Design a protein around this nucleic acid. Structure first.
Ligand SMILES: [Cl-]
Ligand SMILES: [Cl-]
Ligand SMILES: [K+]
Ligand SMILES: [Mg+2]
Ligand SMILES: [Mg+2]
Ligand SMILES: [Mg+2]
Ligand SMILES: [Mg+2]
Ligand SMILES: [Mg+2]
Ligand SMILES: [Mg+2]
Ligand SMILES: [Mg+2]
Ligand SMILES: [Mg+2]
Ligand SMILES: [Mg+2]
Ligand SMILES: [Mg+2]
Ligand SMILES: [Mg+2]
Ligand SMILES: [Mg+2]
Ligand SMILES: [Mg+2]
Ligand SMILES: [Mg+2]
Ligand SMILES: [Mg+2]
Ligand SMILES: [Mg+2]
Ligand SMILES: [Mg+2]
Ligand SMILES: [Mg+2]
Ligand SMILES: [Mg+2]
Ligand SMILES: [Mg+2]
Ligand SMILES: [Mg+2]
Ligand code: NA
Ligand code: NA
Ligand code: NA
Ligand code: NA
Ligand code: NA
Ligand code: NA
Ligand code: NA
Ligand code: NA
Ligand code: NA
Ligand code: NA
Ligand code: NA
Ligand code: NA
Ligand code: NA
Ligand code: NA
Ligand code: NA
Ligand code: NA
Ligand code: NA
Ligand code: NA
Ligand SMILES: [Sr+2]
Ligand SMILES: [Sr+2]
Ligand SMILES: [Sr+2]
Ligand SMILES: [Sr+2]
Ligand SMILES: [Sr+2]
Ligand SMILES: [Sr+2]
Ligand SMILES: [Sr+2]
Ligand SMILES: [Sr+2]
Ligand SMILES: [Sr+2]
Ligand SMILES: [Sr+2]
Ligand SMILES: [Sr+2]
Ligand SMILES: [Sr+2]
Ligand SMILES: [Sr+2]
Ligand SMILES: [Sr+2]
Ligand SMILES: [Sr+2]
Ligand SMILES: [Sr+2]
Ligand SMILES: [Sr+2]
Ligand SMILES: [Sr+2]
Ligand SMILES: [Sr+2]
Ligand SMILES: [Sr+2]
Ligand SMILES: [Sr+2]
Ligand SMILES: [Sr+2]
Ligand SMILES: [Sr+2]
Ligand SMILES: [Sr+2]
Ligand SMILES: [Sr+2]
Ligand SMILES: [Sr+2]
Ligand SMILES: [Sr+2]
Ligand SMILES: [Sr+2]
Ligand SMILES: [Sr+2]
Ligand SMILES: [Sr+2]
Ligand SMILES: [Sr+2]
Ligand SMILES: [Sr+2]
Lengths: 132, 337, 53
RNA sequence: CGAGUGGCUUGCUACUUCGAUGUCGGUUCCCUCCAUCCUGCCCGUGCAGAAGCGGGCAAGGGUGAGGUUGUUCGCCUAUUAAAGGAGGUCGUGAGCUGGGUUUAGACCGUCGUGAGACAGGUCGGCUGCUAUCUACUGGGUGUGUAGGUGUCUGACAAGAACGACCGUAUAGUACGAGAGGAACUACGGUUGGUGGCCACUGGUGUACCGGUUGUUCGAGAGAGCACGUGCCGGGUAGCCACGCCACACGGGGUAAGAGCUGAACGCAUCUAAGCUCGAAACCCACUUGGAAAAGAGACACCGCCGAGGUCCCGCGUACAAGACGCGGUCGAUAGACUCGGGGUGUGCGCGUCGAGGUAACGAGACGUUAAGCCCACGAGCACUAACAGACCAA
RNA sequence: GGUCUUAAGGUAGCGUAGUACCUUGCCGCAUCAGUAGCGGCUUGCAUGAAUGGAUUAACCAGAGCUUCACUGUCCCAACGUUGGGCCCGGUGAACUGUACAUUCCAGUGCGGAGUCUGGAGACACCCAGGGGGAAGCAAAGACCCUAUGGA
RNA sequence: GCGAAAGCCAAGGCCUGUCGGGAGCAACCAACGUUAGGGAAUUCGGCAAGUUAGUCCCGUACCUUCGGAAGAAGGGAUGCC
RNA sequence: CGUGGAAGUCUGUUAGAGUUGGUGUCCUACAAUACCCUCUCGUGAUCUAUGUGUAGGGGUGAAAGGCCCAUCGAGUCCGGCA
């Protein structure tokens, strides 16, 4: 994928619970896979900011729960690194449900987003309110 | 079926024993392309700081933008190519044919050497030329050495001697180039062979770790779950199968870790200089204050502060050289925060 | 730049930038002072900071 | 239908062990096989492209994470380039685990007159030993080659030191009616592996500084104990990963394959001689080790009555002993002193304010005081200690 | 089958159960995925009435499963603390020992060899290590059968 | 302090749960502390560890043999002068 | 609402009794059944000291074929016995 533009440290692993920052009706999300990731024997497949992860709807509306949907990790708690060494971390690790063509499934994106996510999923970017 | 997994640790750097000469000895020198020149220099690791540059990569979108980059400081004062060794080509590889020395030596070269009193340079030189005339002259290397005394941070005065190859020009031409350098005092600086922006090969003897277990040494797992309470924590599963009825030398075992020679490739020389420009507030921890001849080598460098590091024009470069990168900021910020 | 907490003239290539629930951006010159806000402490309240002295 | 190879299933035999070769599954760690799942190069097609289907060469590397079951097996999920199979006493219990089988207790079904049974189910139910030899990991002492120092050589040995993927441009182009939809090449990043390092982020930090609870030294100051820090906060040097740095191309020779010239056979033919090409595979390249390589090495210098080394003394870039490295007054090697660089957070005493209280008394605030206290770092500084001298040696 | 054996011929209930072979039964719940657990169905290989059946509040170091919370159980290891471990003085055993013994690779042999055959390798001694091998040591196998054995 | 509870300290007893010396003291083991992000992914099974925690107040479901369930759950409070 | 203070009642490392897990330490041991943490009971069918009774095909047994001096699906010693 198009170089993120920053060095991360996957704050999440498979089975990890994150918040679905948007208005899809999905509140809680469960990381299930990481698009383009092959680990190594005995390792929790690591999910990080700027990753297209496969996800499951933990908490949400009756129609949304139990759904296997794609998403883009928008926020995460573990720091990332920018070209000038400076680190950046978020009040919480969250993701935006994206679609087949990688465009958001909702319309509103709650809370901030990383200026690195923008590059890749610009359709998500041209929807982001705060872009840090 | 038991998932697959690459073996723990690499087998290339074996045996993992302590090094014989704390002074690195390259086992491969650059090809002869350009003008006659010595193929490497050396210095002493001082410490680490970062620096800000302007992206040189013509391919990166960051090209033109500032960028913070880490750098190891290495005091590289002038060395002295005290001699010239010639190699004759025999049916059993290269063998030292003869050497050519000098008069002007460093006041303290006798701390390690048995300095010459009666040498016959002109004659010895003849031997080399008659051998080249015969078509048996192999390669030309210059016995070299450092002036540890020049660096205050380094306690040692007793010079570190090491041979270095000379190449580039045609056998004849470089031969003379050698003698010329030597036929003075052999004094030369890092700028006499390098230029900021060039990728080099830094070799050094790693930091001393003493004996360590498999986990630390070969990166093997620790006992897990319930297996870490029965009286086994950093010990591996076993030393092999029933048969072969022996212990194969490829199983991770306790041993000497560290103090090994390593030749860290493609180290870009971020900046060559002289003065107190890279020194830190309070002084480079467990080293001291820098002031004078040196090099800012991008990234890490094998070895601890005060250890003799050796440079060499990259034998296997991957990218193209971006001479003299714009170094905007060099950190003077203290290393005790 | 400069620390959004204590007020030290921040060293380039050294630091941490923090976003919040709201979405603001408070920089930190060190985790030493970062962990002060975790203790409800303020830069002015704490004498030892460039703000309070 | 016929011909076989294998030794992974099962079965047959009863050669081997009954003065005992520890079970299944799992786990951890190393080596291997190819009947190749992926990756590379290829042939065919019901081969437009794209995505396939079948086949060849090929064992370099990879072949991951999870849900139920003790399971092996298998079923299922989501990722993937792919999530291949087998051997090593169905590798591995003087390694681990002990869930299943298979003791002694007990229940249910069945059978049994009964004790009790079960090639049924179920709950529970233990894991010894100080390593002589040998083996490999690392570390020393000697002898040999036959005075010393420094620098080399390179027979040999090891490596996967790299593997894979995505994205961009190529290009909405080739191709196709369309739908759909590439490549060469050059770029950026990711992943797995690898070696090294600590400027930065992160962890630790029972050095240290601070708050504070109980109790003891009358109070105050200041201190001990509360597990080997009472607890809470912060935490430098160091070590560290969760941090950071580096890890080719290209050559050479082949395989399968494409071909060239070419005869036996006037033609024809890639082959019989001969030749051009061609795999992630082989050699080289690169890294590592490596004078004990018995053909026991090379070069330079120094010295045989003195080169050099040991001892000793001060210490670490070294360290389980041994080893190693540096310094030893022609000195900054260690300590003290003083800066500097850092840690904590504003000292004791005193002054004022202080809800109140007749007063005594008063938690606290403030100023003095970015104070006091502290540092495993750096500098300056020969003040202290590197003194004294002993021995070996051609 | 619309009585026969042998007296009767399973009624309330409970039921894939600690009983159900088939079996990971079908359905639903639950999870990304559930041979697990619960509910329902149930012809019950081979449920069932004091050989007690069903029911159950409370009780339990009893068996199984789910959720919230927590976390070094794991991802994936790190640093630290105390006692050992290592060197020195002193004290000072035991297990084990047919012999020889520097081994490896194959082969061979009562078919599981340091010692045989052929090769390869190998200068001696010593320190620390983790235990691959001596089908390591420890117990005249508990398993199996046998004995004109025992209880 | 609820306490014959912990912790601390008397009176009293003892330094005889009777071998010492040295190495920032390595590997490895026993006890143990702290670990960012995630949070049972570990395993047969949360085994081990951890979480919770005293006292006061508000409040507390199903079911029940009316005894109980119940400290259910949940929420707030807590020092000093 | 108060008084009352019942119970094979509760919490409890009060004394005391027991012994779930770690399958931890130990396993030529401190110990021929031990150490540590956890855990259970703890006014009763309770715990305990001393004295006393039951003896081997016999006692005793809230029953495990448990226990009867490290000896129990039939104690121990000596004899039959070579
Ligand atoms: Cl293990
Ligand atoms: Cl996955
Ligand atoms: K046997
Ligand atoms: Mg596994
Ligand atoms: Mg630092
Ligand atoms: Mg800092
Ligand atoms: Mg055996
Ligand atoms: Mg093949
Ligand atoms: Mg292979
Ligand atoms: Mg079972
Ligand atoms: Mg086996
Ligand atoms: Mg074994
Ligand atoms: Mg065993
Ligand atoms: Mg069982
Ligand atoms: Mg019985
Ligand atoms: Mg043992
Ligand atoms: Mg059922
Ligand atoms: Mg027997
Ligand atoms: Mg029997
Ligand atoms: Mg009988
Ligand atoms: Mg954590
Ligand atoms: Mg698992
Ligand atoms: Mg537990
Ligand atoms: Mg009595
Ligand atoms: Na143990
Ligand atoms: Na075995
Ligand atoms: Na066969
Ligand atoms: Na096993
Ligand atoms: Na392969
Ligand atoms: Na499985
Ligand atoms: Na076996
Ligand atoms: Na086993
Ligand atoms: Na065992
Ligand atoms: Na090629
Ligand atoms: Na019946
Ligand atoms: Na009970
Ligand atoms: Na821990
Ligand atoms: Na062994
Ligand atoms: Na019997
Ligand atoms: Na009443
Ligand atoms: Na116990
Ligand atoms: Na009797
Ligand atoms: Sr060299
Ligand atoms: Sr070499
Ligand atoms: Sr154990
Ligand atoms: Sr064998
Ligand atoms: Sr293929
Ligand atoms: Sr099997
Ligand atoms: Sr099956
Ligand atoms: Sr296996
Ligand atoms: Sr079992
Ligand atoms: Sr059974
Ligand atoms: Sr001899
Ligand atoms: Sr493309
Ligand atoms: Sr289109
Ligand atoms: Sr203490
Ligand atoms: Sr051919
Ligand atoms: Sr030699
Ligand atoms: Sr009926
Ligand atoms: Sr041992
Ligand atoms: Sr006293
Ligand atoms: Sr004594
Ligand atoms: Sr701490
Ligand atoms: Sr579970
Ligand atoms: Sr699991
Ligand atoms: Sr509460
Ligand atoms: Sr009671
Ligand atoms: Sr158990
Ligand atoms: Sr113990
Ligand atoms: Sr025992
Ligand atoms: Sr424990
Ligand atoms: Sr109780
Ligand atoms: Sr009472
Ligand atoms: Sr007798």
């Amino acid at each position: 994928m198009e170089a993120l533009g920053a060095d991360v440290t996957q704050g999440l692993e498979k089975g990890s619970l994150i918040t679905c920052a948007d208005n899809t009706g999905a509140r809680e999300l469960k990381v299930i896979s990481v698009h383009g990731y092959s680990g190594t024997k005995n390792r929790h497949p690591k999910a990080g900011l700027g990753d297209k992860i496969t996800v499951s709807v933990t908490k949400g509306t009756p129609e949304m729960r139990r759904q296997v949907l794609e998403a883009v990790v928008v926020r995460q708690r573990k720091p990332i690194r920018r070209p000038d060494g400076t680190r950046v971390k978020f009040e919480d690790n969250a993701a935006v449900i994206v679609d087949e063509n990688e465009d958001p499934r909702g319309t509103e994106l709650k809370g901030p987003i990383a200026r690195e996510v923008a590059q890749r999923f610009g359709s998500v970017a041209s929807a982001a309110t705060m872009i840090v | 079926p038991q998932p697959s997994r690459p073996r723990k640790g690499s087998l290339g750097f074996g045996p993992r024993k302590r090094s014989t000469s704390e002074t690195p000895r390259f086992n491969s020198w650059p090809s002869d392309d350009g003008q006659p020149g010595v193929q490497g220099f050396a210095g002493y690791k001082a410490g680490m700081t970062h620096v800000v540059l302007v992206n040189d990569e013509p391919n990166s979108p960051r090209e033109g933008m500032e960028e913070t980059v880490p750098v190891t400081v290495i005091e590289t004062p002038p060395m002295r190519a005290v001699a010239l060794r010639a190699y004759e080509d025999t049916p059993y590889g290269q063998r030292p044919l003869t050497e050519v020395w000098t008069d002007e030596f460093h006041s303290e070269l006798d701390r390690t050497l048995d300095v010459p009193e009666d040498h016959d340079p002109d004659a010895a030189e003849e031997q080399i030329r008659d051998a080249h005339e015969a078509g048996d002259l192999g390669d030309l290397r210059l016995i070299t050495h450092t002036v540890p005394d020049a660096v205050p941070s380094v306690p040692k005065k007793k010079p570190d001697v090491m041979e270095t190859r000379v190449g580039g020009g045609s056998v004849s031409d470089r031969l003379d180039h050698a003698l010329d350098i030597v036929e003075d005092g052999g004094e030369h600086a890092m700028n006499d062979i390098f230029r900021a922006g060039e990728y080099a090969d830094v070799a050094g003897v790693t930091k001393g770790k003493g004996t360590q277990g498999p986990v630390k040494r070969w990166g093997v797992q620790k006992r897990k779950g319930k297996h870490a309470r029965q009286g086994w924590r950093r010990r591996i599963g076993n030393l092999g199968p029933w048969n072969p009825s022996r212990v194969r030398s490829t199983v991770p075992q306790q041993g000497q870790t560290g103090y090994h020679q390593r030749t860290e490739l493609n180290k870009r020389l971020i900046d060559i200089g002289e003065g107190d420009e890279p020194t830190v507030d309070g002084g480079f921890v467990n080293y001291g204050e820098v002031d004078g001849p040196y090099t800012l080598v991008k990234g890490s460098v094998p070895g601890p502060d005060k250890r003799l590091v050796r440079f060499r024009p990259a034998v296997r470069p991957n990218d193209q050289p971006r001479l003299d990168p714009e170094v905007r900021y060099v950190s003077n910020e203290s290393n005790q925060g | 730049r400069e620390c959004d907490y204590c007020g030290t003239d921040i060293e380039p290539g050294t630091g941490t930038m923090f976003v919040h629930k709201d979405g603001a951006t408070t920089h930190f010159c060190s985790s030493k002072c970062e962990n002060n806000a975790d203790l409800g402490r303020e830069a002015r309240n704490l004498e030892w900071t460039d703000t309070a002295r």
